[model samples]
Target: NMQEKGVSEKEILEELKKYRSLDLKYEDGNIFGSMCSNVLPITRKIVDIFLETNLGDPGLFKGTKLLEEKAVALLGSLLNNKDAYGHIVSGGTEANLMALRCIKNIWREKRRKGLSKNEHPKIIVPITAHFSFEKGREMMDLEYIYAPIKEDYTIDEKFVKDAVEDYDVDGIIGIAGTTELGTIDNIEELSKIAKENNIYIHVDAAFGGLVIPFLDDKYKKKGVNYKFDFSLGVDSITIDPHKMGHCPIPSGGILFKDIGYKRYLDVDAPYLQATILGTRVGFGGACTYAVLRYLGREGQRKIVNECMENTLYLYKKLKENNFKPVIEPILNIVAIEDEDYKEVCKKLRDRGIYVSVCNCVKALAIVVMPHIKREHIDNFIEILNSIKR
Candidate 1:
């Protein structure tokens, strides 16, 4: 029921505060399952500056729009696209949805030119692909061939090759950083398959785009090819500035190779741009721009490398504590082998330590995000030890 009277601002804030207190906090480093982390200190100032601006209507907010363009350009540079075309959207889900929508429309244009009856555009999606793809499947009338992962938990290149030969695959989605085990698909292989078959390939590097660039060569997976940027023959990418990029939440990014992809996505609205939503938030773009400019490559590299080290430390400790990692950490994610992973997660959550269970394997997960520190990892191990006993 609606409140009978309007409350004072202070009282409203106090009520909100009470609700916020019950939520799991990142500062405590107890939330291990999330990809997001605390924003850089400078982001607060930038967010405030762009708080009221809206990029949905670029004409009304030109400067705010440029911030998004600049953010896209900066993101493109990292992804090896000099003339990349994309927008800083809500998060990975929206970014991925936009990419999916663009792919669908491109197929629509192709079908129109051929003037032929056709089956739904069949896109090959990895079993390891995030659930966001499923969201698109339900919304977009597209067919998906779920490619199973290999023993290493990455998409099987051979299976994908066979599938391409069998079906009229229109588009392929490759994961640079998978959500469950942080395993990376061999985009190089997928690129070759798409190039030979005249299929569009979109790489979902939402988590890895920011982490992979600066990742140490030593940490690189021996079997996986990390060439997943514009350098390859891929059509588009979903790279979030919020995850490993250290920007605030709501800063997901989508970058196509060039402006040509825009033709398929842009509607005939004379005064509109190419995006899924109207009235988008300007602060996300602003935050993305500020974080990229201030942190640059060097700063980001430092954070990624530190997280990798912490990731290794967690691995070593898990082994020492008699816990089995499903596999060696690929990125900053570690999955411990446990048959009753959900029950284990529940015990930890009951103690106010929140973690998540994965489907790829029988295990519980811990994402060593930026906010996660050595102390927290140690404490988690101790608490886990107590519960196991």
Candidate 2:
């Protein structure tokens, strides 16, 4: 049922506006518990130039390809590895899959070297790990050993260590920021265990990667800080620019210690032989590059600090009101424990205040992004306090 004639631009715009009207507005920062934010205005301008650029056809889009390469390098540096290697992928899901695929290749290589093949390669990860890891497990036909979390919702390193000792683990996953609670795993300690056990480690720092590096020394001094990148023996990591970096959607990164790790997931392709997809979109990379260059280190630090300050402000307010916020945020996410979590979430949404329900911990989760201002927090707290149990 193709249209006999194309509609006018005005007609198209009007129709699109009708659909968009129903969408929640994040510009005022009312939405919470979601990682997405409005794209950096400057980055949006840069992204338009690469709308037609296909990374899969790097030979054709040479300039955009270079942009992607530079973007990856910038992300690598942010992750604490100037010599890191990777490609900008669709998002954290693809990045996490690539990490598992790389580990599978490493396992395959070991099998060829006279090591017995594990009928099912098992990855040890905390219960707090992202759902993307579960997708990786299913797609790779691998088993996952879920470790318990501590009272603060952070990964229990001791439980992970025990799981590693008991299982023939092929890979391990560490979370820099747990999806619901924003609690970081003890990645440094996890790295030591991975090294001792000869297993590949992948840190899913999709949210925290952009937030943690900019935190003040007070966090590091508290020993609650985590090293989630190449500084540790992590084989790979997943970081999403679309989340904390505030770039366009589909902007995610995967980093390795070196190009050697890419060998595991490399495939033959018509254009780019070393990537996951054949016809990959390149605008995400372009947007990420624009944002990184526009912001630089100082700009990024300022954004993170402001967001964290807002997070602390909300958490402190809730705590003083006896709202029982989950372990204080190490990043910008805060979760408030509630016996009636679903009702609380519904109540908040009805009043134009959005928050997510954390099923694991039975809490209402709030994420204070760059767009969330102090006024929004104050308003949300006022509305929340008005709700009766």
Candidate 3:
């Protein structure tokens, strides 16, 4: 194929270099999405070991039963849940979709028994909920009703309460940490409401999963809190180890509070999955297991703490400069708001500085992350001042 394409080795190397340069330069702030680069170093080592072993065990491919159970146990422990099980998936989107699907099935079964199917399943989420929620809705053909965030960007409790009362908020989709906005949508409050209304609450903690465990008053001062795996009534949580957790790309997972929740997503296929050595393999579980083993609780906490500190420093700088940000970062993220954000962002790009901007004009923003060193933040702040001047 290479010969047919008339591609030379030198040209291929040059192309790789150019692509790498663009990625390293412009894709700098993965704070808005998956921060794959942050964990790449560890992932490279693990992948190298896998390749060297020449292991092709398909059964070992998917996160096996024992490993997944262990991971579930570990995450549950971290999230403060003693009883939970999870399925490791490829990415945040898949993990979230599956979680929503499972919840939908569980809710639908309830409706089939006595409720009205004609009502259709409804999921209430914050306006700042991750875009994955939209994707989840599309995958399951479910209705999504959004609760607006207050000026501070947390879910408006009044709006959510009204939504449930008037909009049939049977299945509420909460956020531990949102994607674009980086705001946590009051999971504890939502759980309380869901419990009273007899609704299901699913927390999309993909970005915050790893960060929450290590979070203390320093991080909590920035808005991190103990709101997961407790008696807050959270039904499920989608945690992407690939995002904030120290894991390889394509490693995300969804944990169910009750194993009975999986009945909706169960498939009884035997031929493809019957002889799996360690029990089962699908959705890249081995990689998650490997990464988890490598970065135990302490190790994960160290990196997360470092990132949290860097992000808070950056946040302070932005605020000190009188820059209006979309929302304060709860985990390793911030979105600065500027009247001339569009032009300011362009200026930063011209100056060889990369920062994330929101998708819409009303949402003018900037994102920061752990990959950004103190020097990078200083330079970025200098550029901001220069642009303002």
Candidate 4:
């Protein structure tokens, strides 16, 4: 029911303050997950300019559309391919949906000559793939051929090859960094399979795209140096600015090696022509542009290095406490083996230290984002020492 009377500004402010107090604060350095950290001051300042700007009407919002184009170009360059074309979406989920939709449309066109409408198309994916793939399959009415993972939590290339032989596969998915273990699949190996089978391939590098390329190889630190980019012959990729790019939430990108792939998603509407939505907010573009321009390469590199250092520090502390860590972290995510992982997470949450449980491996997950400092890790470690097995 609607309010009988309009609320005053002071009362609205008081209500907001009440809920803000109950929110999990990242400023105090306790939150640790895929979501953490605050955007740069410059990003926040510039994003305010586009808060009211709608990118759907480029003719009306010319400056905002130009900003988005520049942002996409910057992201394409960061992925080690300047020729890539894309637009900022809500997040990785939307980006993934768009990628799959594009593949499905292309497959329909190619198979229209002889294929029957009743035969459902299939896409091969690993068990470690993000749940968004399942959502994509459901929305598109496509079958998913599940593949097995290897010891390192990477998708088994052999199983993917087998699926191609057994099923009428239309596309393949390779994860750059898995959601639970943060393990990266072998994109180079999977690309060969895609080439032989003549199937489309999409790489979900939502979290790793920003960190993996910037890793320092000079020093012998715990750095990940994996090549999961356009050079590997991936048709499309999903990257989230909110995760490692330190931008605000709902900021993500879906980049294609060639712009022709976007033709499938084109629509002839009254206001919009090609994009998914009719009213698009330009704040994400503004945030991404400001952050990339303000930080540049060196500043972003430092942020990634610091997070990796903290992850390694936490790993050492876990081992010292007799906790069985799953494996050495390739990224800033570390999983600790435990039988009662859910209970352990509950206890930690009670102590005001929140973490996720990796159900695939039955372990407590610890992700070192920009907000997690050395002191926060020390606090979490102290609490871990107190919890009984």
- Local accuracy of candidate 1 as per-residue lDDT tens digits, 1-389: 79888889999899999999988788896899999998898989988888888888789899999989999999999888899999999999998998888888878887989842456778999998899999999999889999998888889899999998887778899999899898888899899999998888999999999988899898886766778888996899999988987888789999998998888886776674677888878988888888878887888889998999999999999999999999998899999999988898999998878888898889998999988899999999999999999
TM-score of each: 0.96, 0.95, 0.83, 0.94
User: Can you give the lDDT of residue 118 in candidate 4?
Assistant: 29
Instruction: Name the regions of candidate 1 deviating beyond 4 angstroms.
Output: 115-117, 268-272
- Cα RMSDs of all predictions? 1.7, 2.1, 4.4, 2.3
| Candidate 2: clashing pairs of residues | none
Tens-place lDDT per residue, model 3, 1-389, is 34555778999899999887656432353223235546545566555554422113444434344555576677776777788766666667776777777767766777878864536678777777667778767766888777777776677877778887886656787777666666677777778888998888888888877776677566675443457654675878888877776566556777878666767776456895111123223324555666667777777777777777777887899889987766566777777766676677677777766555565224434434456677777877787788888
RMSD in Å for model 2 = 2.1
lDDT of 4 at 21: 91
- State the displacement of the C-alpha of residue 338, model 3, in Å, after optimal TM-score superposition: 1.0
Q: What lDDT score goes with residue 59 in model 1?
A: 92
Residue 286 accuracy (lDDT) in model 3: 52
The residue pairs in collision within model 1 are none
Give one digit per residue, the lDDT tens place, for model 2 in 143-214.
Answer: 788888887677788987888777678888889987898888888998999999898999998999988888
On TM-score, the leading prediction is: 1
> Which ranges of candidate 3 are over 4 A from the true structure?
1-18, 25-34, 51-65, 222-225, 267-284, 326-328, 359-367
Show the lowest summed lDDT stretch of 10 residues, model 3. 273-282
lDDT of 4 by residue, 73-140 (tens): 89888877788878888888888988888878777776787663426667888888888898988888
